[PDB]
């Protein structure tokens, strides 16, 4: 504790009551003549201390120093995800025990947790001879960490791994699980550093934090202690320049990462290190949308500079892609504004996203992956493609990422309506050329080829289906024909039933000759087809047999209502069936007078169809979340609906925390 | 008012087959941390215009203290097609002169990812998150108790 | 770690291998017949264990999981503020070494930090002949903490606010500040648990955390479950059930306060522990405000019929009163609306507030203050009287609080601008009864008697003076004339300066002789002696003789406007009262037709004398801040400006960040 060394390399002293050695030391670095007073034996030791303080970034002199361009650079094949280069490193013939130490950490990142327990045990069994026991100690930690990963993956695989996989998946032999339980019994990870020799414990007191199971608490309390500074930054809070706040939170992350990955520590793959990266990067982004829309004035400019936007680079993309789940990014996209954060180093992100594409193509287009590697990898591959809305990709790069999103991603991690979401997100700054359209067109034909079976249904978690792929192509190319979905359309007969219903929902993609062969094979006969034939442009006004089927449907929905409420079975719709009918009656698209006879089963029906007799206390103000530009125009225009909503909407602005109500209250109702 | 003190419940993961709906076994789970979350944004379809904006509904769930999860009472190699089934849910409530609202979820996938913890045993109490799936039919239903 | 002891009072099997010894014990609680079949020595041991687990709130196992709604009790005189019983426990000459341990805690709470250090030093010398050694460890901790409390106070009584505040020098002499330091060098706090025997390191291992400077890092990290509850609010539809992460935060706060006070630990005075209570309580008010305004729910009604809600009680009041500043309560009052949380237990909260009055009274009516105790009591006393907007009071108790606030409070921190705020806030739940008039009416006589000296003035940090007190008497008692303030008025000399205009700042409280005789001194001179009449005099009458001087003032300004127009720079005057004159024409006090013919002045004058023909392109948007509620109420009648002030708020509500503009439109203009 004789010198504070900070995250930039600045050197301020405490408890050094004596001679200022590290205050003086850099003066030998400055003058070549003062260091010429050294002996020709101790000059070789200044030929070594110069290297160590340069590459560890304590080349910054002291407090009597200016600014520093504190870069970061991580030379580790495991951080960048270089999976093929890591495989070619293991197969090489070992020379050093510090090469066996680095093979052991690559075979764990690649999923081989049995081969990695074994090479950690071999190092420990022959690296006690060496005069420095950092390889003994750091392997003795990593092996217990590789024990814990095996021990609670077999707890997962026997439990929640059963009902998420459809198989059993035991990847460790029962002889292997029993050997590692009897070796690692009565091993105490908290007591290993006291088990070390005396000379080790004085020369390596900075490695004692790696065997305490709670080691970033000295960084997590600082992350909190710098969170409430942001929470107390409401009445024009200062220190938003971040030279004493943002750079502190960021350079303490980059030093922890460069410690754990350069020194090959397996503690990096656990939830406690994964959460430190989540808390630190969400704090930098929370101080980037908040503390961006602040009181912009000339008085805040003279207080402090550095009021530019936040900058993400290559290393910040990898850290969000690896350490976040999808929900943790989904918090930030509804909290902060990531379209407001510029991304730099676009061409290095398109070599991390493409290697993620080729670790999914070249590992699922074969007969399969490793399951232990699947558990580690697939969260990273999901979040990297999800957060690639924000980077721009080359045409040859977008083509390879899309063919792994649509074809080789496993269906259990990405169903048909989550593949659609991540395909629509890759267009928002990378609008689809013709070379990517012919990949969606080649995925619509593989979904056609699976409805040849009669009992098959596209399961979706959000109810976006294979239609939306069709409507996405037509949004970018208004005149398009799938010349191969036509060739299956013009070969249809009535025996295939599910074929006809699938290809009808993709009708504008078909050619004008090929439509009529399927137009002649499908008549509108249910309220699903009444609404499926609306969303493809087939129907533009209701020929009044169309108006009959809605009347026909509610007659069923009327008569069950009595014999369900005596039973109490209160139904819940799968989709906006009844609410859309009232929009059809409020916009006068249905003129039937029998429509009023069904007033009273659904409150969203009862708003539109009986716009006075509603008493408005059953209004749910999330109903204005999903109305168009058009409908809200007529909501203002209705002489009854114009003002009760205004009392409802004002208390949804006075009390809530969503900006969309603020947009609705001015743009449509003023 | 009526004595509504009901907070916690007991949720029943039922059983379906790879292409069938067997319901014979069960794999039910205890209290639910229950981040039940309806981020519904489902949309009306307009007659003349069209739009491709974000308009869809979803239901996420999670639970806690799972049990009865072994055999329902080695080719280590994962493949991209999956034909895994979807266990139906029941949620049985209490604390009323009426019977439980008995909320049923019809088709349900299982979305949890694994995670390794430094301390031991990955949690004091595990969690299985569970989304709700739909193809051409209902996604939930409330069987209000009424009598008993 | 064989069992996992949750905070609700339950037990979970954690790492028990063999016979579950906590399963049998709770059976021995429940089955009294099984309790009988024991021996006659392990039966008296069972009474010891039953009285332990019932005072420590360990109810049962989790397998049955009985419905529990347990509450908190903190058996400590120091928590509740019983300063008088603590003093007559210090004077009571002790009998036991675990009773001197309680006094040196109670001395420390009283700011007698010299006699705390010494009495803890006797306990360290005198705990040799004691078996357990608990009072040895917890006295080394407490003396080190009381050493750290002194070494800060030497930097505040000689540091920032050292100037003239009374006992401006140190309270700790030179012989003591040297005697403590020579004893406290090389007391390694980290080497205190390790030095104790291995019997103390296993029979009392749970006190390991108190020997760390970084203590409560392990509870600041777990308070990162705050992210788990920002996550449920941000996901905005998340319906946590059972023991949600809110109730974990509250039951863990309570389990930390009850430990540190009932074990008499001095770390409960530090800033690390105060910030833990701030950050945990602020989160719970936030989740209360979120829940009371959640957007209903279309489908969650199967469980969401209602919620009981976070409500306040007495221990939740003492924690906000002791551990927050006024700056922290105002952050919660900006984000939440605490007038919607119900405050329970309002017979105990009155006894805590009557005590804070009786400690302010018995310390600044006598000349015996303790300058260490005043440093740490005054934040609690300020915060408790500030947070009593929300608790209904009895007219005896509301008297003893208001009397202690106006007369007996120290002037150095709570000036009359802040004494006004904190008596205005007590009128919310309590309509101002008859007696509190008399407590103010004594005070305005005393505030008159301090204005006889010519060099005195009322300094206000806000700007609010004793003028605003007098409204609040008339705001409640519409017919009340202070008799003695009339008796002050009949004895005046016209040679006074400060006494004259002071009674003009309370002229609407005087009698018809006292108003008239003070009106005899009231002599208007010019326009500069007229516009302060609405500021000071308040005649509330606009005679045509006064209106003739208004026309004469704009006429002489029009003669100067000829020079300003010929010079090319027609700048407004420094005493721009023309902008005020349109408002009095708008509120119909001036009814002259020459007010509209006085064009060429400031644009606010033309805005109200002619709202039709005003250049709204030449409108300045910042004018709306300075407009009172009578005007902002009255503009809505002026439809010839209603459609355009809505056009300049909307040109700023999306555009600026000043939320007053939103509050102008959302309260009025809609």
Residue numbers in the entry:
A (entry chain B), C (entry chain A): 336 to 1005
B (entry chain C): 1 to 73, 189 to 263
Copy out sentences from the published article reporting this entry, exactly as the authors wrote them.
As a sirtuin (SIR2) family protein, defense-associated sirtuin2 (DSR2) has been demonstrated to participate in bacterial anti-phage resistance via depleting nicotinamide adenine dinucleotide (NAD+) of infected cells, which can be activated by tail tube protein (TTP) and inhibited by DSR anti-defense 1 (DSAD1) of diverse phages. To defend phage invasion, Bacillus subtilis utilizes DSR2 proteins to sense and recognize phage SPR tail tube protein (TTP), then unleashes NADase activity of its SIR2 domain to deplete the cell of NAD+ and abort phage propagation during infection. Each DSR2 protomer contains three domains, an N-terminal SIR2 domain (SIR2, residues 1 to 297), a middle connector domain (MID, residues 297 to 627), and a C-terminal sensor domain (CTD, residues 627 to 1005). Structural analyses and biochemical studies reveal that DSR2 forms a tetramer with a SIR2 central core and two distinct conformations.
The determined cryo-EM structure of the DSR2-TTP complex contains DSR2A/open, DSR2B/closed, and SIR2 domains of DSR2C (DSR2C-SIR2) and DSR2D (DSR2D-SIR2), and one TTP monomer bound only to DSR2B/closed, instead of DSR2A/open. In the complex structure, owing to the remarkable flexibility of domain 2, only TTP domain 1 with residues 1 to 73 and 189 to 263 was determined. Domain 1 encompasses strands β1 to β7, which make extensive interactions with DSR2closed with a buried area of ~2900 Å2. Notably, loop 1 inserts into the CTD and loop 3 extends across the CTD to penetrate even to the MID, indicating that these two loops may play key roles in TTP binding and activation on DSR2 NADase activity. The binding pocket on CTD of DSR2B/closed widens to accommodate TTP with only a small switch of its helix α42. However, the bound TTP makes contact with the adjacent DSR2A/open, forming a hydrogen bond and a salt bridge with the α30-α31 loop of DSR2A CTD. Notably, this interaction drags the loop of DSR2A/open toward TTP with a distance of 8 Å. This dragged position is almost the one of DSR2B/closed, implying a transition state of DSR2A conformational change triggered by TTP from an open state to a closed state. The combination of TTP acts like a key, allosterically causing the MID and SIR2 domain of both protomers to undergo profound conformational changes with complicated translocation of its secondary structure elements, though the conformational changes that happened on DSR2B and DSR2A are quite different. Thus, combining with in vitro NADase hydrolysis analyses, this conformational change with a large distortion of the SIR2 domain tetramer induced by TTP is suggested to play an important role on triggering the NADase activity of DSR2.
